[PDB]
Design a protein around this ligand. Structure first.
Ligand SMILES: [As]
Lengths: 310, 310, 310, 310, 310
């Protein structure tokens, strides 16, 4: 039984994030638990305050016509408990639920450890014989408690795009709203646990540039290579198959080369050193011990720049 | 209370993918959230527009007879919220739900990293005392929003096989429709993260062909073999027990042989070199350093061709 | 309100597997999604066809008395949606649900990778003031679609034991039926991924029988031992704590010995070789390089036979 | 509407384990699926058999007053389906449900692999204006089918403590009953898979007592130490953080010492052997090769005894 | 139908922990199963005891107006079964449920293995046309059975902050209460299983200070480094990405340096020893064998102090 408007019936939305959690880089999802608020004039519900009880009367959901606001990017439909309904005397309705949904917003792992993401919540509304246009009421959209959590992320700002996108879908226009959650990743921990440990094994690798024992230079350079894979693999886990190159995975891969030529050298500073031409061998090893650190720190400036600097 | 047709009652289906996600190579499943649309003539619902309200009247699901459209390849029954119902005056009904199901379609890992998959959704309908034939209405089957996601997959095309398959099941014919989602894998990331890292460890392996120290050639060749397992295992995880040979697992296994004979050689270039016959030993190592890269790059053309080229 | 039979009321069961999945060797469970079909004469429901509507009338579940068929080996009670009810005129009822349960059937890992399992589904029915006997109707028990999946398993045959087991439980006899699903494991993949890789590391281990450097024979034999654990552990994961010896775990353990004595020898071919008695040492190593492969291939025939051949 | 007793209303309980599974050493829980049976005299329900139908009349749960029997050590409230209700003519009620709960009973990992556990199920009942006392009816407490499973455990005996513990909680006495499940662990598999593999690596370790090459005695003793961690870690996984010392973790830790002094020796038999005093060095190594095996087998008798023998 | 108070209606809360479990350091959550108790005067419910039945009358939840007490830090809404309701004659209502919620409270891993945590439960209540103020009744808040478990934690004390925090949220004041659970970690097991095993591998590392073979000093020091990662990684698992430095992760990282300079030395005591200046080399190694243990034990006092001592 929809409210006989005179034109498109505006319905006034607003989300108040209460809990925010389980951001899942792999699945590109996150859990949210907030308030949903809705308002609309249903002139029928109008009531002489004086002749009746008080300012507003409260109804159960069955009694009133209430507009189906579905979310768009959700796994299942959301779990919502209706907190209150409050018809004003002119026929203005105050609806408030407290939903708990798992949201499917995508992420840009381009700068991975140093990435900033923007999450989305959608809310379509499908029209009928009155058109339904959604729109935001920013007094119930300051939705964000001062304790929203979201581990391993700094939460920058929850806001909403005031202009709805009015699609037409299978012959009844829908109205879609864009609620936005902006987040910076907490990259700190990736340093002591990934970046540094990773760099160290790289350096040890190439003390083989001050050694002359092939036997202890393989035992060295090769053993270190292994550990890099333990890290390569460790990272490549908490991270989806991007069809594009992730910054961290760039440098994590640039590295493999520095282990490769490293080997090449130790191998060469050996074929030379045995081809009775140490003249050359200890010239190479002599230089290797300079070229690598440079070309690395160089390539990383190149890389680092190539990603963030662009 | 079914609509007394005069022949098989056609019911007009149509899916509009809204969200698409959690494709699970291991389980061979994916999550989907779309519109389901249905139409049929229920002459009873017919109504003088002029003597009554307007173009169409809307009903709750309980009021109208509505045909049970179950999905076939689903884990549980799907979670669906009814978006709208709209009986036309001739008795034509417009049903629209927004279901959210976890779909069980199988995949062909034959070309694994470079594989293209086709996913399915089925929709049977069980007949009664009127036969029910489903059929597609392609205006509500352009079902695919321009933001369907599906991480790690490029989405080629959502369409449907217009001719239903009319089975007879336990004495009431059912009508089944085939909705098709075609996808190409995003193979890019498998390169910097699996293929390349994997090839590198292989090459280092066989710098042992320019070494002459057994001790540093095992520490070398053996250490590299281990890492290959870290990769072998890494891959063999995000991947079901195919009863058949997966391309990537082919080359991932072809490799083990190149590690084996590698060892064989270093081992031989040692039993020879100590059987006072370096004449031979440094003839073998001499050639090993050519045969392996060739026979590999050769075998890979052979392999690569054997898979994609056929 | 049970149907006043004149003796034990037979209820006619039948399962039609539609989906079959998530077989979990660790938990000894599997997921299933099938039809449940039931029939019984409730003479009360009988109806003059001529004086009434048609062949059969359909009821909602609340209207008719319907016998509680619980499954026995289930985690929670099963999730079932009622597909149809059809009382015949003599009072014969056609019930059809589509349940989706997680089933708890045990497995025999004795021949592990080459094991064949038989899964079970039970269906008790608890009697009241008429005795209830269940029994199978094999026209609704050809339950098995031609697309049942069950990854990593070949599905041999779904059938049922026609004779119910009529227990008496806490004073009301129950009737239990045995539905059986027989499956052979798809052992193929365990070859390129476990068995072979495993054998290789074993062989490399004992090239130490053609080496004479203790230093490169430990670096060798010990390094390989490690990798075997990586495999030992890998396997010991997707596999419950059987109180009995699993074939694969037999040979996976027989192996440890061949690594042990291997060490013993290299260690001995060293205490001898340094006790100025290479006379003996290179006699041992001489034989070791024959005994091991034999005694192995021998023990494996012994083992293999001991398991499958008995 | 409770039954107006004349004193404490006795309610007669009884559990019949049907399925038993997912014992979780880490979480200290287990899943169970059994019958719950209850009896009480509700004189109101009394009925002239002769003037009425038969021996007993059956009711739905809403009709009769039925006593809330909650379980105590449960994660969530239990999932129970009511199997039957049967009021006798004196007003004696026969209630039978089939619940399925996840139970939270603790375990004594003191003798870990060789531990015997006793699990619990509780059933409080909160009184009102008649006191409610629970008590066991041992004819519905032989609850244990002859197929109860519980992988990796031998099930010794399901029984119950006949005397309830009548607490007073927040001013209404409660009555609590103790159902007991006794289980021995199936320790067999821990031998081929943990204990033995673990002892082997220990012995190999100290063939370094018959070697004289520090270089191959470290590559030896150190490589073996690593593998022990692979086992140390493997075990320390399927096992909660006991605030106390687990037998297995005792010997798994005693071991580390035998690796430590082992190293000490090889290290010493080297500082000695190079301080031109092999007089001593090969006196130490000479004895080391006796002391360790003894002091070990000695300490293990000490340990073993200390745990099981006390 | 709310109770027409004369001022803010106080509602009297109280939790009695019955079961406590699944504390999840990674997710920062825990499961709880307790009693919730509520009291309020609803003068309407008042009843002449003499003219009516007895002391108190009991109602079903539907009959009475009952205040919505939502928990705040919960994943989903909590699963609660109503145990009893008991209106006194003045209109005083005794509500008692037994809920089972998964609670989202954060933790301070600063002292990780030796950390003490405080968990929270919240209970808002949203006002209407009478203000609702919650408050604690400490006779139903001694909520904590003498068998609360919580594996791997010693439970210090369950209590509550008597003064509610009265927020105003979207125009209706809410009242929030703070229930507190204080817990000390059971750090014992982390010793035999992490700390000690970890220290051992560190010591062995630097027996390389009494060795002079570079080849056996890398095979030594490098092999031990690997094992430390097996531990580094092991730990870094059961532990969230803190944006801050965890004590255990401090010392677990301080370590890497002692492996690094260790290498440096062995590498140097080799470039020196071969630059025909053993004068120096065996002066360094001479000192290394003192400096490291000191600077370590020193840094650990520094570290240990830095964390716990501040
Ligand atoms: As190694």
């Amino acid at each position: 039984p929809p409210p006989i408007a005179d034109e498109p019936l505006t319905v006034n939305t607003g989300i108040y994030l209460i809990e925010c959690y389980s951001l899942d880089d792999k699945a590109e999802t996150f859990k949210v638990n907030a308030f949903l608020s809705l308002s609309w004039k249903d002139r029928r519900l109008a009531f002489d305050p004086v002749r009746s009880g008080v300012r507003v009367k409260t109804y159960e959901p069955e009694a009133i016509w209430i507009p189906e606001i579905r979310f768009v990017n959700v796994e299942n439909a959301r779990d919502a408990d209706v907190v209150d309904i409050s018809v004003s005397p002119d026929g203005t309705v105050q609806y408030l639920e407290r939903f708990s949904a798992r949201v499917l917003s995508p992420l840009d792992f381009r700068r991975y450890p140093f990435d900033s993401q923007t999450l989305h919540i959608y809310l379509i509304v499908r029209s009928v014989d009155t058109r339904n246009i959604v729109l935001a009421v920013d007094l119930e959209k300051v939705g964000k408690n001062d304790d929203v959590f979201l581990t391993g992320w700094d939460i920058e700002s929850f806001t909403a795009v005031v202009k709805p996108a009015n699609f037409a879908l299978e012959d009844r226009l829908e109205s879609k709203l864009d609620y936005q959650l902006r987040i910076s990743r907490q990259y700190f921990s990736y340093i002591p646990n990934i970046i540094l440990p990773m760099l160290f094994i790289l350096f040890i690798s190439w003390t083989a540039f001050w050694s002359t024992s092939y036997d202890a230079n393989v035992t060295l350079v090769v053993s270190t290579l292994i550990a890099h894979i333990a890290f390569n693999i460790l990272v490549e886990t908490n991270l989806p198959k991007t069809p594009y190159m992730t910054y961290t995975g760039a440098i994590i891969f640039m590295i493999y080369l520095f282990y490769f030529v490293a080997v090449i050298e130790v191998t060469v500073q050996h074929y030379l050193k045995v081809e009775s031409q140490p003249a050359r061998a200890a010239s190479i090893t002599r230089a290797s011990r300079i070229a690598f650190p440079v070309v690395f720190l160089l390539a990383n400036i190149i890389l680092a720049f190539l990603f963030f600097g662009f």
